[PDB]
């Protein structure tokens, strides 16, 4: 089919961009849990916008990112989906995740299972 | 506060070993501005642009600020830096600033030419602009380039040093300098002593003295010291040491350490600075609510 | 009859006349997460001037007894308040961690690399930096340190804590110098302290991210020779 090529030597700025990405994504993720462990909804618009400058930040160096930081993270308003609304299953569909903003993000779970993402098969991936 | 930062090194090429002779007149010299009156030092090194420029890291500076002349530091109370003016006529193959320039303190240079005034104004990165004032000017200094050049940076510098050499010269000084100061509208201007020797230094009152009688007035004179000699000073420490002008490895303490005035307390090696715990986030709050400092 | 006519160039033409005469509710907060930071920011401000009137009413100094005492008599004010001693070690060890990872300091210091560490932080993102203010234009801005919460283009915002006071700082970053220490993992041997200038980078984040930063004219840095 083609050339097997297998190169090892990351590179320092993607390296740069995505320990940037990663930082931004914890610290939001640890505001938001030390907020939400101890009381209720005190600063919830200050970690979201790490996020969105995070998501600014895929604008700029056009990296993706797996299907599990976007499926945590949402798709308008961009914040962290640790705590939703409401879960709802086989309401005449498939799956709904309501949020407080309304923006719901559904899954096709009713039409079969054993269906993975292109990241999660068994050879498409390699860590570190 | 003052600065002269055109101090000649008894050397124009690699090949050539300097004398013990011409160092001891170099501490000499340094003695003689540290007994007057003066504040800053850069001692200046003339390259060439067809010469064989060395593939080297630690060799391309023959300076030694460290062995020789921090110990004339600790009786001296004073700095140096080293700085390089590059003699370029024309665009010939040698380009290797990226080494030079980051080696270095401040980058100069001398042109001779036309084109080569062009390109160094455009595209070259340089500090300041020297002329050939022991010879004659190229063609024409005009207008609109030096002004959108001093407005991009770059400014122009007189060597007052330069007319105490021989008898003939100060013609084609003065002829020169009247022109660099008509057609650089009085901005970018900063004066520097290019002398070799104590024997041809001079003081504050004199020099001051001296532009006045060449053309520029007495104020713009001294805040052509205070301001703009200590701010292209400024400029190329942060572009060589730091990035380009962006985030510097400099502390910044009360009134003590400065990127220009603290150099010593700067590890030279590569770029830290080891400072100590000052900064707490623990108990710390206001500045004027503290009492421990 | 002189050729400065006043009233007649200006007044009384059709092409100066429009010149002056010479005669003469949870879900709309969070729509846009910008404003509702702005509401966040403003609402912090707002109730530390109410904690400021509160503890002058309370006449006690100590801070540790006016937080209990807002705790006892005021419980829908103490739900905006800041918690300065929470955000301290939520954020500090992070970014330490975060930049000895980053730029490569380990234990192993004599290998170290400072032009690839500087355009490293470039590079980085400041949002959760302990950073002072050690030289301004303003007197009165400096002696400030805090840590981010949020980056500006051209200001610049932290938090600091005084005897009583818990107020979102804001500092304008066109004519200032910045500092933050990075230490290293021994006891008292060895630090690191670095500096920025916010009046150099005048950029969002996103765009700091992609740009790659260029000489400017730098005329306007007198002061950091002047102080
Ligand atoms: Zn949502």
Same mark, same amino acid.
Do not use: E, T
């Given at each position: 089919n083609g050339t097997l090529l297998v190169p090892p030597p990351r590179t320092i700025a993607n390296q740069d961009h995505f320990h940037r990405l990663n930082y931004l994504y914890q610290i939001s993720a640890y505001q938001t849990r030390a907020r939400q462990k101890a009381r209720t909804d005190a600063h919830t618009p200050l970690a979201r916008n790490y996020i969105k400058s995070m998501d600014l930040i895929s604008k700029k160096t056009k990296t993706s990112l797996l299907p599990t930081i976007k499926r945590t993270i949402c798709k308008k308003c961009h914040r962290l989906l640790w705590t939703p609304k409401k879960l709802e299953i086989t309401s005449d569909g498939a799956l709904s995740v309501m949020c407080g903003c309304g923006t719901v993000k559904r899954f096709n779970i009713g039409a079969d299972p054993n269906y993975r993402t292109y990241s999660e098969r068994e050879g498409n991936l390699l860590n570190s | 506060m003052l600065v002269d930062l055109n101090v000649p090194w008894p050397q124009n090429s690699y090949a050539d070993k300097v004398t013990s002779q011409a160092v001891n007149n170099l501490i000499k010299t340094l003695s003689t501005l540290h007994m007057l009156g003066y504040t800053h030092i850069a001692i200046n090194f003339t390259v060439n642009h067809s010469e064989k420029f060395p593939n080297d890291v630690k060799l391309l #500076?023959? @300076? &030694? @600020?460290? /062995?020789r002349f921090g110990e004339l530091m600790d009786r001296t109370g004073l700095k140096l830096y080293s700085r390089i003016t590059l003699i370029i006529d024309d665009p010939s193959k040698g380009q290797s600033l990226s080494k030079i320039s980051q080696a270095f303190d401040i980058v100069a240079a001398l042109p001779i030419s036309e084109k080569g005034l062009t390109l160094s104004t455009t595209n070259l990165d340089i500090d300041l602009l020297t002329f050939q004032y022991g010879s004659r000017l190229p063609t024409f200094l005009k207008h609109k380039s030096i002004c959108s050049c001093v407005n991009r940076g770059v400014k122009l510098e007189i060597v *007052? $040093? *330069?007319? =105490? /050499? +021989? !008898?003939?010269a100060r013609r084609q000084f003065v002829s020169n300098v009247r022109s660099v100061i008509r057609s650089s509208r009085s901005r970018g201007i900063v004066i520097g002593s290019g002398a070799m020797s104590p024997l041809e230094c001079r003081n504050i009152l004199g020099v001051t003295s001296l532009i006045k009688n060449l053309g520029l007035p007495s104020d713009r004179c001294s805040k052509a010291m205070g301001d703009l000699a200590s701010l292209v000073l400024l400029n190329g420490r942060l572009r060589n040491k730091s990035h380009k002008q962006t985030i510097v490895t400099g502390g910044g303490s009360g #009134? $003590?350490?400065?990127v220009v005035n603290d150099v010593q307390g @700067? &590890? +030279? !090696?590569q770029t830290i600075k080891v400072v100590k715990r000052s900064m707490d986030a623990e108990q710390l709050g206001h500045a004027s609510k503290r009492h421990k400092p | 009859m002189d050729r400065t006519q006043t009233f007649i160039? +200006?007044? =009384?033409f059709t092409k100066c006349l429009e010149d002056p005469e010479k005669p003469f509710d949870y879900q709309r907060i969070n729509k846009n997460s910008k404003i509702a930071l702005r509401e966040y920011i403003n609402n912090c401000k707002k109730n530390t001037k109410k904690c400021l009137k509160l503890a002058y009413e309370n006449k006690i100094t100590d801070k540790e007894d006016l937080l209990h005492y807002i705790e006892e008599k005021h419980p829908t004010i103490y739900e905006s308040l800041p918690q300065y001693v929470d955000f301290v070690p939520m954020y500090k060890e992070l970014w330490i961690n975060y930049i000895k990872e980053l730029l490569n300091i380990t234990k192993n210091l004599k290998t170290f690399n400072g032009s690839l560490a500087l355009l490293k932080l470039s590079m980085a993102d400041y949002n959760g930096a302990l950073l002072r203010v050690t030289k301004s234009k303003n007197k009165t801005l400096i002696g400030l340190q805090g840590i981010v919460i949020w980056d500006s283009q051209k200001f610049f915002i932290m938090i600091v804590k005084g005897n009583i006071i818990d107020e979102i700082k804001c500092i304008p970053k066109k004519g200032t110098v910045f500092q933050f220490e990075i230490p290293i993992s021994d006891d008292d041997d060895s630090a690191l302290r670095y500096s920025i200038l916010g009046d150099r980078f005048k950029y969002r984040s996103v765009d700091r991210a992609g740009r790659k930063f260029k000489s400017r004219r730098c005329d306007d840095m007198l002061y950091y020779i002047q102080n």
């Open positions: - | #500076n023959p @300076i &030694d @600020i460290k /062995r *007052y $040093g *330069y007319a =105490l /050499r +021989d !008898v003939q #009134n $003590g350490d400065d @700067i &590890d +030279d !090696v | 160039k +200006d007044c =009384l």
